[PDB]
Amino acid sequence: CGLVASNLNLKPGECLRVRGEVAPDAKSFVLNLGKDSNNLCLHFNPRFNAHGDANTIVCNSKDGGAWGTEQREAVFPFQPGSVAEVCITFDQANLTVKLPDGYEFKFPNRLNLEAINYMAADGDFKIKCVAFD
Template sequence: MLKTTFRAGQTLTIGGVPTLKAEDFSVNICTDDNNIALHVNPRFQYHDDKKKVVFNSCQGGSWEQEIREGEFPFFHGTEFKIVIKFNGKDFVVTFSDGTNVVFLNRIGLEEYPFINIHGDCSITSFNIV
């Protein structure tokens, strides 16, 4: 887990490459492991999902309603970019193919102290402005 503050008005850009046999990976913007404001989970083949991006949040250790929107712009071994603009009310997530998904800031804080990226990918770039 990376300790860094992500505030309303900022944009997070993450570049990476899924492994050749990736099942899934995730990006979490959170206060801790039990309070995740934004969970972005590209799933190549994970649980019952195949080539789906799952969005969710977690409060007090309880996962909330999942959202599955947009295309699946990820390919094994091919670089991706995820841009997350945080306006306080929503997180606007944009993928390499230009797909946008708006996800409500369900926890409602104006800043989050941790960003957690884990799973079957290598991160090549990370920037907050």
């Protein structure tokens, strides 16, 4: 798979910035955030052409190994063959994901974790820069 980072200790309100290159023939990519691979407060999955979906942002949680209820966003500000940046923060109610074009969406915080300690990237996205504040 792709980059895995742990012991991040990202607290509420602190920003996680991730910049990467979207493959020219990208089918999808994933950024997973949470405690570990079984406990994700955000599974962020832009699907260019994957699982039957096209140009769709899919979000979900995973709690104790179990996928939660999936949600989708209508907008898709990713282009294959381009560099994309995503900035993520959270509070007790929502994750807030800020997207390249300045789009911003929220995803409910279903896990109640004190911090984001784990990030994993997968798929057609080559990570170039990760920053914390």
